[PDB]
Amino acid sequence: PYRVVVLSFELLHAPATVCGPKKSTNLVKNKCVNFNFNGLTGT
């Protein structure tokens, strides 16, 4: 016997809910930096 588990990838036309994690780095201050706060990119 050999148990098999298969994970199914399905992407329907609707907003997504569960997906890969995004790493939030350290918060630096008093320096010129290119930042990104929950998708908001700026310098």
């Binding site: 036309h13 609707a14 907003p15 809910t17």
Partner: protein
């Protein structure tokens, strides 16, 4: 949503108030009509 105290009857209160967001649910379904629960 927004809540406010009132001491009035049979009439919409006169005033200004803003409705803050409460929860965002992206179900992604179509809707055409509704009805409350009571």
């Amino acid at each position: 949503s927004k809540h406010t105290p009132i001491n009035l009857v049979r009439d919409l209160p006169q005033g200004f108030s803003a409705l803050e967001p409460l929860v965002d649910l992206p179900i992604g379904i179509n809707i055409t009509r509704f009805q409350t629960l009571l």
